[PDB]
From a paper:
Furthermore, cryoelectron microscopy (cryo-EM) and cryoelectron tomography (cryo-ET) investigations have demonstrated that binding of RsaA to lipopolysaccharide (LPS) molecules on the C. crescentus cell surface is also regulated by Ca2+ ions (von Kügelgen et al., 2020). Based on previous structural biology data, full-length RsaA has been predicted to contain 22 putative Ca2+-binding sites; 19 in RsaACTD (Bharat et al., 2017) (numbered 1–19) and three in RsaANTD (numbered 20–22) (von Kügelgen et al., 2020). To verify the Ca2+-binding sites in RsaANTD, we reconstituted the RsaANTD:PS (RsaA bound to the O-antigen oligosaccharide of LPS) complex (von Kügelgen et al., 2020) in vitro, in the presence of Ho3+ ions. Ho3+ has a high propensity to replace Ca2+ ions (Weis et al., 1991) and we wanted to use this property to spatially confirm the location of Ca2+ ions in each RsaANTD monomer. We performed cryo-EM single-particle analysis of the reconstituted complex, producing a 4.3-Å resolution map. Comparing this Ho3+-bound cryo-EM structure with a Ca2+-bound structure solved previously (von Kügelgen et al., 2020) showed strong densities in the region of one of the proposed Ca2+-binding sites. The proximity between this Ca2+ ion and the previously resolved LPS-binding pocket suggests that it might play a role in stabilizing the RsaANTD:PS complex, in line with previous results (von Kügelgen et al., 2020). (A) Density map of RsaANTD:PS complex supplemented with 5 mM Ho3+ before vitrification shown as black mesh at a contour level of 20 σ. Site 21 in RsaANTD could be replaced with Ho3+ and observed with single-particle cryo-EM, suggesting strongly that it is a Ca2+-binding site. Since all three proposed Ca2+ ion sites (sites 20–22) in RsaANTD were stable in MD simulations, we expect that these are probably also true Ca2+-binding sites, with sites 20 and 22 having less propensity to be replaced by Ho3+ under the conditions used, or Ho3+ is not capable of substituting for Ca2+ in these sites.
Numbering used by the authors:
A (entry chain A), B (entry chain A): 2 to 243
The structure:
């Protein structure tokens, strides 16, 4: 049985020192009183609390891992999510009009195609490969292929959907309008980055797959105030949380 | 098998020393003779007896808990329900023309928006949140969300109903006419209080949910004359009756 004052501290540390909105406080409060009456177990309540930190935090853990091969350190996460120094950060003013999806896409393009940390590596790996393959391989990397089928979701129907011509056209226009790219190669390259972003979203929302399960465990460890692993130059998810 | 003289004592202590009306005596009598013939079990008869004390007592236990975080002590309950000192009390002359519903609404507005004990806390918690969210979160706090679905009642249909525009308009007029509030903020705040009141009624009438089940157990303990928990400065329902 959690006091409503414990669930807010668990939420605050997950959000890296951002105190919850008035609205969400009421949501947390419901989860507390549903544990005092035994209409909800303890572990269940805590998971739902940490589910609310998806947009702010999970966006920074997941994308960094996929592109640079390592999740940011606790100190680094602070900078990306909730800081004094970064004027514009994930739980700040700039981003308050981006949905969950457009947050993932934003982070992806940044890290991948710009002067970002992942640019040189992602540029060499995904050159001269088709949209179809980009999606298929990435789907398997993130969500697994075996795991998805066991979970009951049909892989073939999902991959086809993401790579249909209508989808590609939508992104092409999106990337052309928003990003300062004009070259034919860089636009192509950025579209791929946006697709992988879309997949990361689709992963974290369903809870299936390796990426989603590890990120959940990192946020759980981060909940209590102190991150156990906390290597100075980044934590590799798959090493630390088996 | 209960003698009709035992069911009246069980009713009297639940009502805190108010002896039942002529009409209800006849109802209790039926419940007695239905236990002597074995057309009704013992526990069943006693529950129905205590179901009749809903309007008078359950109104004071439930509302106090929701707004001040603690049900009133036995001594306090006496004051609210059936006393010499309080000229106007729940089972007295003032309230004899209020239905069950309007009793809940009355108590809510008192405790929440006035100079009542809950004013300062409720004022800070429910400021700058919409009608929709007020209802949704409160529904879950009181009735549970998981519990309701298992019980078979569809949550979405019920919450939508409570927050439909027609409902809000009815209350707005109601609050404006009855309460001495003229400010635009206080009226807004009082409407929310009235909604939560409506939900408390809807809870106690169906028997579903954490709030309703605990209040039933407190009344059962109060039935025999002596309240076991009886902390001087209030009994927290969810601690005392697991
Ligand atoms: Ca900032
Ligand atoms: Ca930890
Ligand atoms: Ca009196
Ligand atoms: Ca007792
Ligand atoms: Ho922070
Ligand atoms: Ho009394």
């Amino acid at each position: 049985a959690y006091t409503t004052a414990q669930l807010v501290t668990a939420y605050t540390n997950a959000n890296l020192g951002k105190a919850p909105d008035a609205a969400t406080t009421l949501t947390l409060d419901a989860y507390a009183t549903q544990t005092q009456t035994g209409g909800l177990s303890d572990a269940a309540a805590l998971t739902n609390t940490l589910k609310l930190v998806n947009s702010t935090t999970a966006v920074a853990i997941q994308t960094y891992q996929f592109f640079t091969g390592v999740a940011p350190s606790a100190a680094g996460l602070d900078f990306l999510v909730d800081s004094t120094t970064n004027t514009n950060d994930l739980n700040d003013a700039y981003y308050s009009k981006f949905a969950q999806e457009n947050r993932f896409i934003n982070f992806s393009i940044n890290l991948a195609t710009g002067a970002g940390a992942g640019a040189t590596a992602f540029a060499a790996a995904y050159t001269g490969v088709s949209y179809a393959q980009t999606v298929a391989t990435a789907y398997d990397k993130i969500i697994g292929n075996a795991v998805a089928t066991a979970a009951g979701v049909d892989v073939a129907a999902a991959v086809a959907f993401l790579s249909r011509q209508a989808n590609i056209d939508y992104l092409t226009a999106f990337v052309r309008a928003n990003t300062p790219f004009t070259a034919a190669a860089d636009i192509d390259l950025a579209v791929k980055a946006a697709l992988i972003g879309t997949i990361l979203n689709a992963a974290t929302v369903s809870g299936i797959g390796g990426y989603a399960t590890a990120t959940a465990a990192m946020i759980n460890d981060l909940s209590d105030g102190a991150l156990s692993t906390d290597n100075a130059a980044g934590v590799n998810l798959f090493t630390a949380y088996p």
